[model samples]
Target: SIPKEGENIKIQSYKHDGKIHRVWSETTILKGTDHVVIGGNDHTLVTESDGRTWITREPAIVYFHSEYWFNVICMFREDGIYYYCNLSSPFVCDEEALKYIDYDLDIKVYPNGKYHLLDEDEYEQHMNQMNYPHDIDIILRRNVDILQQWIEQKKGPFAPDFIKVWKERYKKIR
Candidate 1:
């Protein structure tokens, strides 16, 4: 199930063995459907697994898909949009929150299209510690490749108008 458009919701990220990794206090849904969710939040409260709390510094537009093993956060900064993509399980929504398994891998992409893979070491450690299934590992890796291709081709949320359109919706709603 998905949140309704303009609904305020919390987002929770979890680890493989069923521990909360992080939580975003509130986000406004820009669009939501059975397969996809797009949201916006600014200076939202964030809670870490260790109980530390902080506020996100900038406005961000987020994208999640039910079939893709990843999520993207587009940060609006002074210089340009900076995308932080998390390699994670497909998202699911419940009464409590929008939730997903956060596999450790990430991709940080600059506005100029250059990107870097992050947290392979952490992923490896978690894979061993959590006993990730062999096929799950393969699927996650394959999705990473798909994510990179999207970045390169400016596909999906990376498209020029994606953020602009959502940002406009956010302005009216938020």
Candidate 2:
């Protein structure tokens, strides 16, 4: 049977060297498929649809928005593809960390309010009110360039191809 959300369950943790680790009683099992898995360390929480997969959520992000921390909007998608961005604000990352992280590739922004679905004329008016800068294109280009550099440094020659595939998948619905 599938576990219900917020259902408390005792989970056993095993060490890598074939030793039985401590049994945790505070684990709250989340709803998912029959094989849902949860894991974490002192500073992060990870969940997977199946026991073999995982998604790590940084504690720093949670700390910034504790009130909405475990909201449904913060849940990961079923396919393990996209993350829901509505639960947390876009500015959660610290500037220092943002310098090293690939914002363009790793993060997605979802507009949830009516302003996000505005018509052309309404959008234009909204943009004006928001003081939207004309240099947004330049900003995006620069951030993408930085992300490309970061990826290349970490992934070697395979970075471009990986990024190409990722970009093709992450498209704006509107």
Candidate 3:
């Protein structure tokens, strides 16, 4: 079974080469199910690979999908929502954390809905070195298309209102 809703949790992502990418030392879950987990964090410590750490600037509502190859973070700023999404393995949960391998490909979404895919060259290099299977290639590309559609269609978690509600849910816990 998954962690109960409202529990504190940790999140870790790895590189395709099996190196640590980043870790959110803590976050609070707003909702959890077999398919998705919604979480939020503000001022949580994030440790980088070099042993340096920093706290988040603002609250963020996070989305993790068990059926998809990406995780999205809707970061609330004084300006607006800035979304950073990782193209990665589907999420898994254990006693310690929810974990994935970040694969280095990412989507950066701006507040006004403009967005861009990032780090493709790096992704190619890593993909070759890490020997990502051919089937995994197909799935990763397919999920990128799926996520693009969600952004364009203003689907549930991609809608502007989505983060607002989850951020509020997170605030109550703080």
Best by TM-score: 1
Off by over 4 Å in 1: none
lDDT of 2 at 96: 19
1 versus 3: better lDDT goes to: 1
For model 3, how does the per-residue alpha-carbon lDDT over 1-174 read when each residue is reduced to its tens digit? 576777989999888777888999888999999999998898999999997999998889889988889999998888888889899998899998999989778899998987799998988898899999999888888888898888898886788678768877788887
lDDT-based ranking: 1, 3, 2
Model 2 weakest lDDT span, ten residues long: 95-104
lDDT of 1 at 108: 98
lDDT of each: 0.95, 0.27, 0.87
- For 29-131, candidate 1 gives per-residue lDDT tens digits of 9999889999999989999999999999888999999999999999999999999999999999998999999999999999887999999999999999999
Error of 1 at 61 (Å): 0.3
What is the lDDT for 29 in model 3? 90
Residue 93, candidate 1: alpha-carbon lDDT? 96
Q: By lDDT, who's the top model here?
A: 1
Model 1 lDDT on a 0 to 1 scale: 0.95
